[PDB]
Structure 1
Amino acid sequence: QVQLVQSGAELKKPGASVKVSCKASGYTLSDYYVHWLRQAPGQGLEWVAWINPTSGRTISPRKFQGRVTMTTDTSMNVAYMELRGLRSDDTAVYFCARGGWISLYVDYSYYPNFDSWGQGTLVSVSGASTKGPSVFPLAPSGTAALGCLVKDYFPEPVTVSWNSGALTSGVHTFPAVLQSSGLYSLSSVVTVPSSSLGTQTYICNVNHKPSNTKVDKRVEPKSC
């Protein structure tokens, strides 16, 4: 299908710069405008830019004009956004989205018609240092629920899959808890048939990009 896949999450200290990539598939990047917007967590949407991949032409509001640099690499079907002078106000989820058809005869650049979005990229700015998570199996309690406990990490988010993406049904990943220590912890359960225990191998694949931590955990029934 038509899909946009953005780069992993990032933790940056204030004053630094971040670079988010948006990788197109199912269509040619240079045929449509690329828009970039962001969303402070729990807040609203904020449009940051549009770019024509063919001409390189960009527009942004006055607020971002000095800080933002939009580019493209059509050879790889990729759009790039660099944000500079990072401040705590900049902590948000960043989306690239596909805009209107690029045409010689009509200008669709500022048309706010985003029919395809990227999954988002959480970039957080803070003085706190990154902490990788500790992952523990949650042994299975005609169905049963087994899971994974992801403990003590910073910043958000972590991504939890199962069987390297092979398992998709019955999976529930719960929102993380912010402990008083300033760290995050979450859990992710799968509800599987009780019969399949002892013969089907269940593995949670946990990924915390800001600390570059990739952990695969085999969850198996208790030692009984």
Structure 2
Amino acid sequence: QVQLVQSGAEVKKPGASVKVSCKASGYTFTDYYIHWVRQAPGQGLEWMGWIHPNSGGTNYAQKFQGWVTMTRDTSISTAYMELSRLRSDDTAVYYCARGGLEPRSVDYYYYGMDVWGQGTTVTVSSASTKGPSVFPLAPSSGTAALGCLVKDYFPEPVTVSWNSGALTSGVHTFPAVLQSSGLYSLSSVVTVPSSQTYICNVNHKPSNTKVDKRVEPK
């Protein structure tokens, strides 16, 4: 269970700054360097730099050195990364990965990045966090429709389940669309037998919004 778990999505105004965390478990934290990789939407991978969890020594890519600050706390096996004076260009997924063995050595004992965080999405925007409306999408109708429309929210992401984790299979939750408004919208819909109160648990953490919506046939 060798694992790196990063903190959740963040949204900051331009000029602000952010600290992202990456927690190691399942191996000795001080046995490997921690690296950070940027990936802006639709782009490729960029090495930002690394840190020795043992010494705290750091090394930065040209492009990222000076406005990026990597630290760490060995007592909880967590690597942090700070991004200062954010701009829109900075919107991206940020990974931590584990690669390279201690100690230093004249030649780097580096065998690629073998274990990766799940990435953290950092969005830079001046838009204000808004909660979604959640409307019911009754079925018409064998299999039935039934669904839930989450409308005009900001920002990504949003986590819907069905009937409190109960109804899983059949649940298709679609990748959101970006509207002209700047607000996102997606729908989660469940194909079911035509022949049981169906509720969809929608939750938009960033606006502290959680609605429950029962979907009944008209």
Structure 2 length-normalised TM: 0.83
Deviation string 1:59-87 (CA, Å, 9 cap, x unpaired) is: 11122111111111222221111110111
Q: Secondary structure at the match of 1:159?
A: coil
CA distance in 2, matches of 1:90, 1:167: 38
Deviation string 1:29-86 (CA, Å, 9 cap, x unpaired) is: 3222211111111222211121111111111112211111111122222111111011
Show the counterpart of 2:201.
Answer: 204
Deviation string 1:105-128 (CA, Å, 9 cap, x unpaired) is: 57547x372222222221111222
Amino acid at match of 2:212: K
Deviation string 1:121-173 (CA, Å, 9 cap, x unpaired) is: 21111222222222334345564444332211123232334455565544322
Contact 1:176–1:186 under 8 Å retained in 2? yes
Q: Structure 1: 5+ residue runs without aligned partners? A: none
- After superposition, the Cα gap between the structure-2 partners of 1:168 and 1:26, relative to the gap in structure 1 and judged at 3 Å, is farther
Contact 2:32–2:102 under 8 Å retained in 1? yes
CA distance in 2, matches of 1:107, 1:167: 54
Q: Structure 2: 5+ residue runs without aligned partners? A: none
Q: Secondary structure at the match of 2:96?
A: strand
Show the counterpart of 2:63.
Answer: 63
Show the counterpart of 2:43.
Answer: 43
- After superposition, the Cα gap between the structure-2 partners of 1:67 and 1:140, relative to the gap in structure 1 and judged at 3 Å, is same
CA distance in 1, matches of 2:72, 2:7: 14
RMSD: 2.7
Show the counterpart of 1:136.
Answer: 135
CA distance in 2, matches of 1:180, 1:58: 42
Contact 2:49–2:58 under 8 Å retained in 1? yes
Contact 1:137–1:217 under 8 Å retained in 2? no
Bigger radius of gyration, 1 or 2?
A: 2
- After superposition, the Cα gap between the structure-2 partners of 1:55 and 1:179, relative to the gap in structure 1 and judged at 3 Å, is same
CA distance in 1, matches of 2:137, 2:33: 46
Contact 1:163–1:205 under 8 Å retained in 2? no
Total equivalences in the alignment: 217
Q: Secondary structure at the match of 1:182?
A: coil
Show the counterpart of 1:127.
Answer: 126
Percent identity at matched positions? 74
Q: Secondary structure at the match of 2:21?
A: strand
Contact 2:94–2:119 under 8 Å retained in 1? yes
- After superposition, the Cα gap between the structure-2 partners of 1:145 and 1:22, relative to the gap in structure 1 and judged at 3 Å, is farther
Contact 2:132–2:204 under 8 Å retained in 1? no
- After superposition, the Cα gap between the structure-2 partners of 1:60 and 1:105, relative to the gap in structure 1 and judged at 3 Å, is closer
Show the counterpart of 1:3.
Answer: 3
Show the counterpart of 2:217.
Answer: 222
- After superposition, the Cα gap between the structure-2 partners of 1:16 and 1:104, relative to the gap in structure 1 and judged at 3 Å, is closer
Is 2:31 the partner of 1:31?
yes
Q: Secondary structure at the match of 2:63?
A: coil
Is 2:135 the partner of 1:149?
no
